[PDB]
Amino acid sequence: QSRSAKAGLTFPVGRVHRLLRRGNYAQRIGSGAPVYLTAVLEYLAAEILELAGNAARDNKKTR
DNA sequence: TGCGTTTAAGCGGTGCTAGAGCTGTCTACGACCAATTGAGCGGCCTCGGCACCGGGATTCTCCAGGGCGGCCGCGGATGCATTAATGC
Numbered sequence: 787q788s789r790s791a792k793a794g795l796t797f798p799v800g801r802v803h804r805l806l807r808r809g810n811y812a813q814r815i816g817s818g819a820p821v822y823l824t825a826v827l828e829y830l831a832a833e834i835l836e837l838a839g840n841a842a843r844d845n846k847k848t849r
Numbered sequence: 850t851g852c853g854t855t856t857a858a859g860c861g862g863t864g865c866t867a868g869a870g871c872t873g874t875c876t877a878c879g880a881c882c883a884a885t886t887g888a889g890c891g892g893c894c895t896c897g898g899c900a901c902c903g904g905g906a907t908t909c910t911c912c913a914g915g916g917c918g919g920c921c922g923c924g925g926a927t928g929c930a931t932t933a934a935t936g937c
Contacts, residue, residue: 788887788888816878847898848897848899
């Protein structure tokens with residue numbers, strides 16, 4: 787099983803971590819950076835999607 | 850813009866201590882590689898959401914007729930000029 791499931795995170799911690807590793811950012815990356823990044827992206831995406839869905843539903847649309 | 854004044858920074862100088870800066874040490878702690886499988890992903894075919902127009906109710910804008918105080922066409926005078934029969 788992946789850490790995202792045991793941490794209840796929808797976004798992939800492993801994918802973010804491997805993006806950071808090959809993203810020429812720092813040679814040493816702690817385990818907290820990928821989980822923090824996944825959490826913040828999940829929060830931002832959730833808020834944006836909720837607002838967009840509100841804007842869609844107030845215009846008689848389901849998309 | 851110009852002036853009297855007054856509240857006030859700029860400045861010379863001190864004693865420190867909370868705090869910035871360089872240095873061993875080990876101890877957490879991640880870099881890297883067999884090995885797997887399981888979730889991300891390529892492809893597909895459909896029905897429900899969506900695109901666009903119809904029929905009226907509704908809402909919006911915009912048209913003209915009617916009662917308000919000043920008008921510019923006209924007619925006649927009666928003077929300016931002309932004119933013809935007659936006394937001289």
